[PDB]
Design an enzyme around this catalytic site. Structure first.
Site, PDB file in Angstrom:
ATOM      1  N   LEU A   1       0.844  -1.185   0.000  1.00 54.48           N
ATOM      2  CA  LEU A   1       0.000   0.000   0.000  1.00 54.48           C
ATOM      3  C   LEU A   1       0.882   1.239   0.000  1.00 54.48           C
ATOM      4  CD1 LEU A   1      -2.675  -1.041   2.658  1.00 54.48           C
ATOM      5  CD2 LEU A   1      -2.855  -1.217   0.183  1.00 54.48           C
ATOM      6  N   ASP A   2       0.317   2.343  -0.474  1.00 52.99           N
ATOM      7  CA  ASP A   2       1.036   3.606  -0.525  1.00 52.99           C
ATOM      8  C   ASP A   2       0.780   4.415   0.742  1.00 52.99           C
ATOM      9  OD1 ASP A   2      -1.617   3.719  -1.404  1.00 52.99           O
ATOM     10  OD2 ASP A   2      -1.296   5.657  -2.382  1.00 52.99           O
TER      11      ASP A   2
END
Ligand SMILES: CCCCCCCCCCCCCCCCCC(=O)OC[C@H](COP(=O)([O-])OCC(O)COP(=O)([O-])OC[C@@H](COC(=O)CCCCCCCCCCCCCCCCC)OC(=O)CCCCCCCCCCCCCCCCC)OC(=O)CCCCCCCCCCCCCCCCC
Ligand SMILES: CCCCCCCCCCCCCCCCCC(=O)OC[C@H](COP(=O)([O-])OCC[N+](C)(C)C)OC(=O)CCCCCCCCCCCCCCCCC
Ligand SMILES: CCCCCCCCCCCCCCCCCC(=O)OC[C@H](COP(=O)(O)OCCN)OC(=O)CCCCCCCCCCCCCCCCC
Ligand SMILES: CCCCCCCCCCCCCCCCCC(=O)OC[C@H](COP(=O)(O)OCCN)OC(=O)CCCCCCCCCCCCCCCCC
Ligand SMILES: CCCCCCCCCCCCCCCCCC(=O)OC[C@H](COP(=O)(O)OCCN)OC(=O)CCCCCCCCCCCCCCCCC
Ligand SMILES: CCCCCCCCCCCCCCCCCC(=O)OC[C@H](COP(=O)(O)OCCN)OC(=O)CCCCCCCCCCCCCCCCC
Ligand SMILES: CCCCCCCCCCCCCCCCCC(=O)OC[C@H](COP(=O)(O)OCCN)OC(=O)CCCCCCCCCCCCCCCCC
Ligand SMILES: CCCCCCCCCCCCCCCCCC(=O)OC[C@H](COP(=O)(O)OCCN)OC(=O)CCCCCCCCCCCCCCCCC
Ligand SMILES: CCCCCCCCCCCCCCCCCC(=O)OC[C@H](COP(=O)(O)OCCN)OC(=O)CCCCCCCCCCCCCCCCC
Ligand SMILES: CCCCCCCCCCCCCCCCCC(=O)OC[C@H](COP(=O)(O)OCCN)OC(=O)CCCCCCCCCCCCCCCCC
Ligand SMILES: CCCCCCCCCCCC(=O)OC[C@H](COP(=O)(O)OCC[N+](C)(C)C)OC(=O)CCCCCCCCCCC
Ligand SMILES: [Zn+2]
Lengths: 128, 459, 32, 174, 63, 55, 56, 99, 171, 88
Positions: free
Chosen positions: J42-43
């Site tokens: 995930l960012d």
């Protein structure tokens, strides 16, 4: 349609609208590093005695002492009777006293004239 | 008055002839007996004052001031027992002698029937006071505060001596009873303008009058706790007491000579009360509060109305017990943190639950909470001045608001908020400290039940 | 203990006086 | 028995009779009976016992009477032993006259509350005395200052008399 | 704080309860005086012009 | 402005300052007999010529 | 009137008992909140007897 | 150094040697006695008996005597139909006006 | 200071929170929350400083114009109703040293443990002070961070006031 | 204040209970030590939302200076338990 945020002395400029926060160079980054160096050099000196287990008393704070000394003892030696001080002092100092003097003399002179003529109501006035 | 003069003198032998560890017990115990016997002065009659002899008398103006003066002496001894513990025994006795000598002069000042015997004793309460400030202070500034306290008073007193002697040469005597029936109107001439300015300047320096008050933030701050209590509770009322008497022989010139002092006092109320809003020193904040409270006393005395004189007498007594309590409260913190800065120790209500109650009661009396005698006196002066000029209600009103701000600001700043982290030497409040405050506040509130005994001769 | 050199003084005129003040106040010679 | 009824006049009482036009019980009457049995009875018995203990030991106190002495209109200038007598007399009168006004004020205040809504018309008699005694008090004991004395009161009286004797000539000389 | 308040209560009541009891007995069993006209050819003493017993005692002994 | 500067500047400070200046004039003396006695002559001449104390 | 006067003041006095008793340490802690509540309850009833007498 | 001087002594807490201290004296035997005299004479002799003495003072400045006298005069004035209070304090027959 | 990456992360959280203030309802907030994230992803890849700063600085102006006059504040967060509501009970632990012994005997076990901690603090102090004199640069520290314990029998330097601090709900 | 005391088990369950309701994390590969960038992919912008959901979950605010420094399901449990004074 986003009007600029005009600031006053009682409404500081938000840190997210200040141009200085978005044009950052190497010199500014270096400066912010030594602001944190003093903030970190002073912190430890407070901590090296805050956490000391044999210390009971008050940790003298020189910044606090200078603040109180500047407010009380260091004002007159740095006072010069220049043009600003003389006008401010005469205005703030002598102004109100002369103003109030004529507010009360006129009020009392006006009241004295009536009491000597009977046209002032004092029917039930026996407490003075 | 010999039944009070001699016992006061006998405290000095008691202190110097007592066991080394009973100097405080013996002096405190017998000084409390003298206070108990001081209530015999309340034999006042509604027409004639109590006239003991050719030298001393006691009317209703000086009776409460004698009772108050003799009652602080035991309280000054309690307050001084901490910072003098690590002091030479011979020096501890000399300190107590200065307090006793000061009382001996005060109880003769308020009772002197002649105005020159009054002056000699009124001016004699400068050596014991000056020595206490200069010899038993803590800061370097005590010496400079002594010089200010000394040359402000003498610069005003010496013309008073010339004026009193001039009055004696003309009227024939300076006995206060004689002056009542031999008083003559003061005709308007430049000579009488300066007789008036010499009979009132010595007293207005000690009140103090705004402008002639720079010695109060010095003397009352740099002095020891005992010096602060007597300075702000009994010694500021010497000028007030003398004025109530010396204005007898200054009519009708007081009608127009009073304006520049009513104006300094009325405007000096707001200025001095406003300084307190921005004081970094807790003790100095209390010192300026006395300049703002005594400003009403000057206004009340000068306008010369039966309601003003009743208020001035009540204000002087009420201010005596309240200012002394605040200095004692501020001194309790100082003996723990050894600093007078008001923002150094905070949140002390979390660590000293009972002492924070004493702060509230002192603050509530300071801001004239009804029905305390701090409000009865202040209320009367407001009623008197409104009849003097309806516009004065504005200046009195502003003072009340500022007074409430700096009284609660002092309470909130030191008691509430979060306690300072690195202050870890807040010992639980001593019985001596708690009992010291209980001796200030309990008499003050009891007077609300019988206020007539502090309203002076106009009741 | 606080000495004379650790207390505020007169307005600083020369640049060396400015640096002495700034060091005394735990600021940077530029911010001060 | 109690306070003299002539100084403090009391209009005669007039209590309406009970006229219950409802079959429901009246809470006040039942409450009144309880109060007169649980409060008024033990209070009366206790007071009677206390009153009896006084009867065994009865002693009296008197009202000091001040012989009238020459006033300030009879003292030579700077004769203190005569001014002192006169000044003390004038001070006692100043105190007594301060109480006469208070009595008249008590009359006026009692009338307003007693008369309820109809106080504007039925309290004119008391309001008429209060206007006259206050004027009398204001004439003899006003504007004298905090250092008041029989001399100052005499000085005010003579100044008033001179103006009365002055304006009378022009006012009366028609 | 509790110890001080206990001591304050103790010493206030040390001479307060006897005075509260003493004042109660004096009023109940001696009562006050009754105003009466001064008998002709009689000079009351200065302490007989006061109603309450304690007022008279103060005048007779000290004043 | 009004309690730490000007109320100090008019009455106490200026009065105190002047006394120091007056004190220096009276005491800043060189200790020479030639000059002390030269002043006595001035006083005698000023007494007779200006104030006429000899009449 | 005798009933009206006595019961009007008892309402005021009743509300000062919790303060007076708590001053001289003459109570039981952990029951004070219920002590004060009950005093307000009885003060309320005593205030209705003068009220009914006025309504009458 | 610039001189030979003692070090700033530490403040001595009185609750260490005597954890029952009243704060008067460092000697426990005398510490209690100083507390008794202050509390007894201060609170049990002056505040209690002094208040009782003040409460029962003989008529203070004859403020109660003035009431009795005024009640007489108002009664006598009204009984014999005279003004409650005459506007003249001194009889205007022993006064000799000028002119 | 805060890096350009940090500034966008803050402006994203703060923008969402003020959006939640306007929308109130979850369904309405969710619909406009996904759209708000859309305006970030599209420019999330551009890597030109002028374009990055210009986008961020312009984003700040839009936020300050569209901000809620009265945003939601968590009860115990700064500015909230319950903020510092319990600072009047957080009595520091050193106050226990002045308890009268007659009341230290009500808790014989607790004060017994308190002696272990007090003893455990005297022993480990001299070592901690030494550790900071050997991990410190010549002049002085340049960052606000403390080191960990590098050996058994050593506690982290400057731990007493972070460990023995008053609880969040003291009473 | 008439509220349940949080427990180390309870805090962990709810934090996992929330991350198991996020449509970018596999509810069967998520452990208490799964990094939000490397072990889950995930960012950071998706990390901001995770902290917000946790902060809305426990009804208090995590500062940004500490929100961005917490990237693990356990760092959110040792942090909350530290702020709420949870030891067992
Ligand atoms: C009639 C209507 C018209 C007139 C009405 C007049 C009244 C209205 C006044 C207007 C102002 C309204 C009141 C504002 C209150 C502001 C202060 C406040 O809010 O807190 C209440 C304040 C402090 O309460 P607190 O915050 O809980 O602090 C408690 C401590 O933390 C410690 O807590 P604790 O639980 O451990 O113990 C509690 C208590 C425990 O107390 C004790 O154990 C010892 C207390 C002994 C009291 C001794 C009384 C004085 C002795 C006189 C000597 C006479 C002897 C004669 C005896 C009879 C025989 C003749 O400790 C104390 O509180 C010490 C306080 C000592 C001063 C008390 C006040 C003395 C007044 C003296 C009488 C004067 C009354 C005249 C009116 C004055 C102006 C209001 O207490 C009060 O003063 C309440 C009474 C005032 C009302
Ligand atoms: C709460 C209590 C409510 C009131 C209770 C009812 C009783 C009551 O209060 O009235 C009784 C009285 C007043 O009530 P009273 O006067 O109306 O009635 C009393 C009884 N008869 C009717 C006989 C007169 O209270 C007092 O008088 C107490 C006054 C105390 C004065 C202070 C004395 C101590 C002085 C020691 C020196 C301290 C330094 C002082 C310095 C200043 C000196 C001027
Ligand atoms: C009811 C209506 C109330 C409306 C109040 C309008 C008065 C506003 C006065 C004011 O805004 O002055 C604020 C001033 C600081 O403002 P500044 O940063 O100098 O820039 C100019 C912005 N006014 O603050 C100051 O220090 C000077 C205040 C000017 C005098 C105001 C008198 C009113
Ligand atoms: C009375 C009127 C006072 C107002 C007129 C002032 C005239 C003036 O402007 O004086 C300026 C004068 C020159 O100043 P400048 O040239 O700038 O620099 C050299 C200073 N030596 O500056 C001076 O140095 C003149 C000396 C100072 C002025 C002293 C006179 C009193 C000043 C007012 C103080 C009033 C305080 C009274 C407060 C009482 C109530 C609190
Ligand atoms: C009613 C009206 C009341 C009005 C009163 C106004 C106030 C009166 C003056 C207050 C004087 C304040 C005394 C403190 C002076 C002071 O602080 O010292 C300043 C200065 C320093 O000298 P010094 O102390 O010796 O040096 C060592 C310092 N560590 O000291 C000096 O250099 C000189 C100090 C001596 C001068 C002050 C004493 C005389 C004051 C009375 C007036 C004198 C009049 C002289 C005669 C008129 C001149 C012809
Ligand atoms: C600023 C520094 C102070 C400088 C200003 C003040 C100086 C004033 C000049 C001295 C007073 C002038 C004077 O002597 O008053 C006139 C008059 C004496 O004349 P006399 O003999 O009484 O005439 C009728 C006799 N049958 O006087 C009398 O009738 C006697 C009354 C006593 C007068 C002595 C007191 C003079 C006032 C001193 C100043 C008052 C303010 C205090 C300030 C501190 C100095
Ligand atoms: C602040 C630091 C300094 C503190 C020390 C202050 C000392 C103040 C000195 C007080 C003496 C001032 C009086 C000087 C003049 C002498 C008195 C005089 O000659 O007044 C006579 C005049 C005649 O009275 P009249 O107004 O005509 O009414 C009819 C009466 N039959 O009567 C009158 O006109 C009445 C008015 C009296 C003078 C009014 C002056 C008002 C000035 C403003 C207030 C004070 C200003 C600050 C003072 C200086 C500082
Ligand atoms: C039996 C019964 O309870 O009801 C009877 C009553 C009818 O009685 P009545 O109206 O008198 O019949 C005509 C007779 N000529 O029927 C009624 O209508 C009675 C109505 C109820 C009256 C009682 C009211 C409650 C009592 C309240 C007492 C306190 C006053 C209220 C609080 C005051 C607050 C300001
Ligand atoms: C000055 C006015 C003057 O010159 O004096 C005139 C004076 C009046 O003359 P006459 O009419 O004869 O009256 C006699 C009554 N005895 O008759 C006279 O001649 C008296 C002259 C006396 C002059 C005294 C001057 C010196 C004192 C002033 C203070 C000096 C201050 C300097 C101090 C040194 C400081 C460093
Ligand atoms: C009529 C007026 C009568 C007034 C009587 C005098 C007032 C009371 C005097 C003071 C009382 C006092 O202080 O007693 C203290 C006394 C202590 O004396 P002591 O035993 O020798 O010392 C022990 C110290 N460890 O305590 C005892 O010894 C017991
Ligand atoms: C009564 C009584 O009995 O006084 C009781 C008290 C002693 O208190 P206690 O009973 O010993 O215990 C209670 C005290 N605590 C709590 C400390 C244990 O007396 C004193 O402190 C007296 C102090 C010395 C005064 C002696 C001379 C008195 C002269 C009186 C002149 C008017
Ligand atoms: Zn100390």
């Amino acid at each position: 349609s986003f009007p600029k945020y005009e600031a006053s002395r009682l409404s500081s400029l938000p840190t997210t609208l200040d141009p200085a926060e978005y044009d950052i160079s190497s010199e500014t980054r270096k400066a912010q590093a030594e602001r944190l160096a003093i903030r970190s050099r002073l912190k430890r000196e407070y901590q090296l005695q805050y956490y000391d287990p044999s210390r009971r008393g008050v940790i003298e704070d020189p910044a606090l002492v200078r603040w109180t000394y500047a407010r009380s003892a260091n004002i007159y030696p740095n006072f010069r009777p220049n043009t600003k001080t003389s006008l401010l002092g005469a205005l703030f100092g002598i102004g109100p006293l002369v103003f109030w003097y004529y507010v009360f003399k006129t009020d009392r002179d006006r009241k004295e004239k009536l009491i000597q003529e009977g046209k002032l109501d004092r029917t039930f006035n026996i407490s003075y | 008055m010999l039944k009070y003069i001699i016992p006061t003198i006998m405290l000095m032998p008691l202190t110097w002839l007592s066991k080394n560890n009973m100097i405080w017990v013996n002096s405190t115990a017998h000084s409390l007996l003298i206070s108990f016997t001081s209530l015999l002065l309340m034999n006042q009659f509604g027409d004639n004052s109590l006239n003991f002899s050719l030298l001393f008398f006691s009317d209703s103006l000086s009776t409460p001031l004698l009772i108050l003066t003799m009652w602080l002496l035991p309280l000054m001894l309690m307050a001084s027992q901490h910072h003098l513990s690590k002091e030479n025994l011979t020096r501890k006795k000399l300190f107590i002698t200065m307090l006793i000598s000061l009382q001996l002069f005060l109880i003769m000042t308020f009772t002197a029937m002649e105005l020159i015997l009054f002056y000699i004793l009124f001016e004699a309460t400068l050596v014991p006071t000056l020595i206490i400030i200069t010899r038993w202070g803590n800061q370097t500034e005590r010496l400079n505060a002594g010089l200010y306290f000394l040359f402000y008073t003498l610069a005003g007193s010496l013309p008073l001596l010339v004026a009193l002697i001039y009055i004696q040469n003309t009227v024939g005597s300076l006995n206060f009873l004689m002056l009542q029936y031999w008083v003559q109107p003061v005709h308007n001439s430049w000579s009488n303008v300066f007789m008036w300015l010499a009979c009132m300047m010595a007293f207005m320096v000690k009140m103090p009058l705004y402008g002639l008050h720079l010695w109060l933030p010095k003397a009352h701050v740099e002095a020891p706790i005992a010096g602060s209590m007597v300075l702000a509770a009994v010694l500021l009322k010497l000028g007030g007491y003398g004025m109530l008497r010396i204005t007898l022989i200054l009519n009708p010139m007081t009608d127009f000579m009073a304006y520049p002092f009513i104006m300094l006092s009325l405007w000096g109320m707001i200025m001095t009360s406003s300084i307190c809003l921005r004081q970094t020193d807790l003790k100095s904040l209390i010192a300026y509060s006395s300049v703002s409270h005594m400003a009403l006393v000057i206004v009340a005395i000068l306008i010369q109305t039966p309601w003003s004189y009743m208020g001035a007498t009540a204000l002087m007594i009420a201010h005596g017990l309240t200012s002394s309590m605040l200095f004692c409260l501020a001194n309790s913190n100082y003996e723990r943190i050894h600093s007078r800065t008001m923002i150094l120790a905070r949140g002390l209500q979390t660590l000293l639950p009972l002492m924070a109650t004493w702060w509230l009661l002192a603050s509530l009396t300071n801001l004239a909470l009804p029905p305390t005698i701090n409000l009865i006196g202040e209320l009367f002066v407001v009623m008197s001045t409104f009849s003097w000029s309806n516009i004065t209600i504005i200046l009195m009103g502003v003072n009340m608001v500022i007074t409430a701000l700096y009284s609660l600001y002092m309470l909130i700043m030191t008691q509430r908020g979060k306690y300072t982290y690195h202050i870890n030497n807040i010992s639980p409040s001593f019985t001596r400290e708690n009992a010291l405050m209980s001796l200030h506040i309990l008499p003050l509130l009891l007077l609300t039940l019988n206020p007539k005994i502090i309203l002076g001769p106009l009741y | 203990h606080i000495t004379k050199d650790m207390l505020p003084g007169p307005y600083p005129k020369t640049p060396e006086e400015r640096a002495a003040a700034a060091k005394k106040y735990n600021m940077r010679v530029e911010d001060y | 028995d109690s306070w003299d009824k002539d100084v403090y006049p009391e209009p005669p009482r007039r209590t309406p009779a009970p006229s219950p036009q409802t079959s429901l019980p009246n809470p006040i009457t039942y409450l009144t009976k309880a109060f007169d049995l649980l409060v008024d009875r033990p209070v009366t018995l206790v007071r009677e016992f206390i009153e009896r203990q006084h009867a065994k030991n009865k002693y009296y106190y008197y009202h000091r009477e001040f012989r009238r002495v020459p006033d300030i209109t009879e003292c030579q200038e700077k004769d203190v032993l005569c001014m002192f007598e006169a000044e003390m007399q004038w001070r006692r009168d100043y105190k007594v006259d301060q109480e006469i006004v208070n009595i008249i004020q008590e009359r006026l205040k009692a009338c307003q509350q007693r008369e309820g809504e109809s106080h504007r018309q039925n309290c004119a008699k008391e309001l008429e005395q209060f206007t006259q005694v206050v004027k009398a008090y204001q004439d003899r004991y006003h504007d004298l200052g905090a250092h008041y004395s029989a001399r100052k009161c005499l000085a005010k009286q003579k100044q008033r008399m001179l103006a009365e004797r002055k304006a009378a000539k022009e006012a009366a000389a028609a | 704080d509790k110890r001080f308040l206990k001591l304050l209560r103790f010493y206030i009541l040390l001479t307060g309860i006897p005075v509260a009891i003493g004042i109660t007995l004096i009023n109940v069993f001696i009562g006050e005086a009754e105003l009466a006209e001064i008998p002709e050819g009689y000079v009351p003493e200065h302490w007989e012009y006061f109603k309450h017993p304690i007022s008279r005692w103060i005048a007779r002994t000290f004043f | 402005l009004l309690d730490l500067i000007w109320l100090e500047a008019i009455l106490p400070k200026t009065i105190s300052l002047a006394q120091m200046k007056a004190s220096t004039l009276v005491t800043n003396q060189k200790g020479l007999i030639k000059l002390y006695f030269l002043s006595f002559l001035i006083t005698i001449l000023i007494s007779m010529i200006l104030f006429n104390f000899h009449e | 009137m005798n009933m009206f006067s006595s019961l009007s003041l008892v309402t005021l006095l009743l509300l000062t008992m919790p303060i007076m008793m708590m001053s001289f340490n003459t109570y039981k802690p952990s029951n004070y909140p219920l002590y004060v509540k009950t005093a307000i309850s009885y003060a309320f009833i005593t205030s209705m007897i003068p009220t009914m007498m006025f309504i009458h | 150094l610039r001189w030979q001087e003692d070090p700033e002594p530490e403040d001595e807490n009185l609750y260490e040697k005597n954890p029952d201290s009243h704060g008067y004296d460092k000697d426990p035997a005398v510490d209690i006695w100083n507390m008794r005299v202050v509390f007894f004479f201060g609170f049990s002799i002056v505040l209690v008996l002094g208040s009782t003495f003040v409460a029962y003072l003989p008529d203070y400045r004859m403020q109660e005597w003035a009431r009795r006298e005024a009640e007489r005069l108002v009664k006598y004035r009204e009984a014999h139909g005279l003004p409650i209070m005459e506007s003249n304090c001194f009889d205007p027959s022993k006064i000799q006006l000028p002119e | 200071y805060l890096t350009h990456q940090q500034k966008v992360l803050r402006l994203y959280k703060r923008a969402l929170r003020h959006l939640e203030s306007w929308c109130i309802h979850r369904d309405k907030y969710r619909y406009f929350a996904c759209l708000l994230r859309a305006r970030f992803d599209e420019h999330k890849n551009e890597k030109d400083m002028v374009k990055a700063t210009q986008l961020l600085r312009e984003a700040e102006e839009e936020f300050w114009h569209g901000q809620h006059p009265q945003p939601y504040i968590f009860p115990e967060s700064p500015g909230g109703t319950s903020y510092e509501r319990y600072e009047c009970y957080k009595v520091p632990e050193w106050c226990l040293d002045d308890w009268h012994p007659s009341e230290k005997a009500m808790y014989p076990d607790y004060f017994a443990k308190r002696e272990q901690w007090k003893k455990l603090r005297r022993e480990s102090w001299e070592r901690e002070v030494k550790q900071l004199q050997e991990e410190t640069p010549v002049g002085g520290p340049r960052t606000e961070a403390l080191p960990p314990a590098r050996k058994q029998g050593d506690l982290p330097p400057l731990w007493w006031h972070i460990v023995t601090r008053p609880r969040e709900r003291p009473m | 204040s008439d509220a349940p005391p949080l427990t180390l088990e309870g805090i962990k369950d709810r934090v996992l209970y929330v991350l198991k309701l996020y449509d970018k994390i596999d509810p069967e590969k998520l452990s208490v030590n799964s990094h939000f960038m490397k072990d889950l992919g995930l960012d950071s912008l998706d990390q901001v939302e995770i902290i917000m959901a946790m902060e809305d979950e426990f009804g208090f605010e995590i500062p940004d200076i500490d929100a961005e420094k917490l990237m693990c399901p356990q760092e959110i449990v040792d942090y909350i338990a530290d702020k709420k004074d949870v030891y067992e």
